Symmetry: C3
Subunit: 98 residues, 3 copies
């Protein structure tokens, strides 16, 4: 179960955290950690927390280490976002934690 999703970054922030799991050397995985209502990801509805992040546009995350993922994610966010994930459901509705 893989889905590729184009994010609407005119109407909407992504509203997610991205987490690395035992992936310092790239032998782990990269996952959607959390999703918050109000962002582009929640708007689309198809991505879920714990889904495995496979690609963001031209960046292939599937076999990437944490640091290399961090490198490319800064270039992607501060410069459309198309995300591919493997499905593998908790969602933040509201928060006033600082």
């Amino acid at each position: 179960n893989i889905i590729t999703v184009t994010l609407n970054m005119e109407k909407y922030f992504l509203g997610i955290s991205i987490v690395g799991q035992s992936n310092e050397r790239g032998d782990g995985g990269i996952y959607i950690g959390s999703i918050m209502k109000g962002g582009a990801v929640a708007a689309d509805g198809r991505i879920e927390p714990g889904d495995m992040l496979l690609q963001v546009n031209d960046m292939n995350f599937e076999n990437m280490s944490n640091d290399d993922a961090v490198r490319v994610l800064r270039d992607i966010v501060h410069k459309p976002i198309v995300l591919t994930v493997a499905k593998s459901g908790e969602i933040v509705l509201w928060s006033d934690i600082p």
Copy 2:
């Protein structure tokens, strides 16, 4: 029936933000549940001390028990900032954030 341990808490918003997140579990269509996610020291909920992460949110002042995620978002936006005490009713389900410098 008798099936949950329910508590109702009147928060002190004079002295205190709530300092919580509210999460939906499998609840895009209202067939899931709405729970207390995390609780941060410094807010009203932590000050009171009775509500815990994972407690199921039943009512705020608004009935949440059988509400969908999106319908809850709408309601929460407009109810938590209204004047007065805030009253949370939760079903007890059996970590409190102390400090974070993550921006």
Copy 3:
């Protein structure tokens, strides 16, 4: 407590520890204080030795092993931004291998 580590963080290079700290059953100091989450870009991630779920024992001069949540909040706010090195001592009770790489959640 069979496996304790002490790490000196380089707060020259990094502006923040990049962690959360949580208390479990610790309103009266009878529980534990733990590393919650760890974010890339902070000094703790850069060091790499501390893991979520590791138990916080000491921060510089302050013993955290049997401190109440409320007392811990005050101390961390008082001391973490003070001059010089930050020395963290943890028991390796943690695991799961999770590190936050990025987030735009407010």
